[PDB]
Structure 1
Amino acid sequence: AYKLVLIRHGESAWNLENRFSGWYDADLSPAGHEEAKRGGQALRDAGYEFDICFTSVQKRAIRTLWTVLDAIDQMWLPVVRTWRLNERHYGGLTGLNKAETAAKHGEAQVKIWRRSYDVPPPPMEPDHPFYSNISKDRRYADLTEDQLPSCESLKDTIARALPFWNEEIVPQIKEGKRVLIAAHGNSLRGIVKHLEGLSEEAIMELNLPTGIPIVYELDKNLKPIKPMQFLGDEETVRKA
């Protein structure tokens, strides 16, 4: 009976989604913006109403949310932003393309990081071009030194996302509030993994499509009663 909608932001500027964008605050590209607008139009056409929204503190997820709320005429909804729904922090790899990461760290290590669930990438160090940009960003000024990551394994990302799910989102759902979450590939994995009880390998194989509303139907104990559903026109929905 409970309905929960997830949406993963689309394409970010400068191909950063293929360059471990991570905690760098890339904006949506105009194509990414268009993708969100189509996602929002699909929600409008399907008559979806929400009562509250959760997003990260990254502008690409926020803009995705804004674009959806505008399209569905629900700009008045309460919105809660949290760093705990941020993309995975990719450490020293942040901003590098594939050739560059291989050239830097070798195929051996890259392959290890690709498949690992709890081996973190190299920490982002003071020589990294995004070091002060991210580490000194005012939006993280309330994180303890311990909480502010220099890098994250997928397991770390999920571990700091889950508490927010549990303490902030779950209660809303239990009150029958219709939740919309606009976040990132890796933070949304955390939620799916908890919802379905997937294995570490299962979750690493899940590639959530972008720009597409992902619908969950949950029973009174917030266990899904069926597989996730994708909303959208035939061409978009097909690619999955």
Structure 2
Amino acid sequence: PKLVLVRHGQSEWNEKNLFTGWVDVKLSAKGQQEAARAGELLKEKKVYPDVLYTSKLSRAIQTANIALEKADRLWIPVNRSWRLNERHYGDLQGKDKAETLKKFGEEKFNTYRRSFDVPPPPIDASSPFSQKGDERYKYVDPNVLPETESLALVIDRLLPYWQDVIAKDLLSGKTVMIAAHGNSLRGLVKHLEGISDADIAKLNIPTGIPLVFELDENLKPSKPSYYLDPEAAAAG
């Protein structure tokens, strides 16, 4: 089995230092260029996904699209899941990152930001930045949909989708591409490689460079993962 991970480029909210989470912000101008770059790289390195999986967030879907266009594999079957979404950013959604750094303190900031299991505070249902009741989730059990998340919770909800849905395709011989987010992709990597809960806070997946994993029959790295641009990704 062959799997390809792609982290979308920057979000418009990202360019203005705002916490996005499940807010459906779109890609930035350079975000869009990285998508082309990612697709460009996909073609260059001869990696052809047979299927596409994306979250329900437009910034990821755009990336997948601009990338497949450039890769010449737009015809590919596509499935989307709330499960591959970014980490819900609780009450922190839509708030300035420099400003949240001074509201709380570095300690509590890195907790609400990088605590493996401490999610930001729950966002109020009436806040303009909560998507509780959003059209794209009307068919999902209302109760599973979070109002805040941590990488811990994210992994919980991501794994089933990988176990049943994504895995069936991998096990069928198809090459899959997953256009997703930072925390959602980070969670799959932690799981995919066997990284401790204390170490996961140090791994960051760069945006715009396809990360490939050649998996064995048990869906585990048969060889080490690789970026299609080891040089750019190496930078950090």
SS at match of 1:180: strand
Is 2:227 the partner of 1:230?
A: yes
Structure 1, unmatched stretches of 5+, are none
2:115 matched to which residue of 1?
116
Q: CA deviation at 1:51?
A: 1.1
1:159 matched to which residue of 2?
156
2:50 maps to amino acid: D
Q: CA deviation at 1:112?
A: 2.8
2:235 matched to which residue of 1?
239
Q: What is the number of equivalent residue pairs in this alignment?
A: 236
Cα 1:20/1:51, change in 2 over 3 Å: same
Q: CA deviation at 1:111?
A: 3.4
2:152 maps to amino acid: K
Measured against aligned partners, the alpha-carbon deviations of 1:170-216 in whole angstroms (never above 9, x if no partner) come to 11101111111110011111211221111112222110010000011
Mapped to 2, the partners of 1:238 and 1:226 lie a distance apart of 18
The percent of aligned pairs where both chains have the same amino acid is 50
SS at match of 1:23: coil
2:129 matched to which residue of 1?
130
Mapped to 2, the partners of 1:18 and 1:199 lie a distance apart of 29
What are the equivalent positions in structure 2 for 1:1-240 lying under 5 Å apart? 2-15=1-14, 18-126=17-125, 128-131=127-130, 134-232=131-229, 234=231, 236-240=232-236
Decide whether the 8 Å contact of 1:16 with 1:95 is kept in 2: no
Cα 1:17/1:177, change in 2 over 3 Å: farther
Q: CA deviation at 1:155?
A: 0.5
Structure 2, unmatched stretches of 5+, are none
1:46 maps to amino acid: K
Mapped to 2, the partners of 1:151 and 1:194 lie a distance apart of 21
- TM-score where L is the length of structure 2: 0.93
Cα 1:219/1:36, change in 2 over 3 Å: same
CA RMSD of aligned residues (A): 1.8
